[PDB]
Amino acid sequence: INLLDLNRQQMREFFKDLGEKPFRADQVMKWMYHYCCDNFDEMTDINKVLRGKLKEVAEIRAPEVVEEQRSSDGTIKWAIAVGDQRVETVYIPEDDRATLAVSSQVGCALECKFCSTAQQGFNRNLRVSEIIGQVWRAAKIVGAAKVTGQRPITNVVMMGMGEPLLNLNNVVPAMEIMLDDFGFGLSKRRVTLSTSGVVPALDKLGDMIDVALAISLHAPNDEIRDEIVPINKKYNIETFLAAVRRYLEKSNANQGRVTIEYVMLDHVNDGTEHAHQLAELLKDTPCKINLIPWNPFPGAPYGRSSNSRIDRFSKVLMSYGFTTIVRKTRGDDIDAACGQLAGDVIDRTKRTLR
RNA sequence: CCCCUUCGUCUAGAGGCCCAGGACACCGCCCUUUCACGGCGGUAACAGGGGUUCGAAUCCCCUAGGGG
Ligand SMILES: C[C@H]1O[C@@H](n2cnc3c(N)ncnc32)[C@H](O)[C@@H]1O
Ligand code: MET
């Protein structure tokens, strides 16, 4: 029994089940997440008998890091071992903050055409310990909170491999741990779950946890979205934005706005005609816009909008009063930029034959 | 017998620099451009009780909880 699979409720449960008081769950979480301890013999403020009781009944096993790559950006990407397979995790330092992109499945069940995770197939969901484990290893490797004196991580984004809303069972507990004060103590506002639009699971999310929301929109109408982000064929743009607005109603994390992700595919969806449509489309949705220049990956039929097109496109949106930021491209030299995470996946869907 | 207990969390603190300071969280406002969620602001603690002293988070006692 591995305590990295457990959130606070559950660890309390666990400690009651050992005839021991529930504040013990707070102590152990502090060692685990504030110091990145994987070793009960260091928990100096737990009496020696219980300290030993734990070693018999439980453990703290994060997946192992088996690769590391540094970019001129400063950006780092670690590959973690997940049985025979690998998912990948990205650390992004900016001046006043540090951000971890976290993987949430082994590949992705979805088929976005501009995504490299999509082109590897899909194997399985990640367990809680394999999600929060990514935040655990990255915190230890960077410099643990009460070990260097600084928060190693200030923001997390569920923007690694996989679609988060197709693994709510594990995504939510893991986000719960991130937010927890005896966990990493991060902020609602600085944990951004991004989703391609699995509407029912978003409604479900609303009833489970309040967390900042971004959406992989990527087109200004269904005819295009059908082609690049195929799940649109099952939950279309209007259905999705309705769901989004349902989430935003009951959410402090988002501060009344959703972040719109829109990847910039050269001469596909990135002309000023599209910006005009996009502005219209979003007239009834309080948001801010994040333009993402496309990051390439082997075999793709696409190209990256030139900066002139991006610049023009963004200015149209700005005419209509939208906050429009171009996401700086980070980790491209090591295939760690958004979309480039292929990991190592044993596809179980036969993505190839088809 | 000895040591520890200060906002949600980690802490600042040595008889007056403290009706308790910071960071983060939380909450609020704003995002018509700081964004791989951004800017600003605000609420919030001396474990509980009794003493010593002009004055106690700080010194003494008792209690509860925790460690050797
Ligand atoms: C994580 C964010 O990046 C987007 N995304 C997926 N693939 C790529 C790529 N090759 N380049 C840029 N962005 C991508 C997702 O659709 C999501 O919005
Ligand atoms: C590479 S995408 C990562 C998060 C989710 N799949 C989304 O597309 O928004």
Ligand code: SF4
């Ligand atoms: S984009 Fe998000 S959803 Fe679409 S494939 Fe890549 S990962 Fe899966």
Ligand SMILES: [Mg+2]
């Ligand atoms: Mg929190």
Ligand SMILES: [Mg+2]
């Ligand atoms: Mg306390």
Ligand SMILES: [Mg+2]
């Ligand atoms: Mg102190």
Ligand SMILES: [Mg+2]
């Ligand atoms: Mg924000």
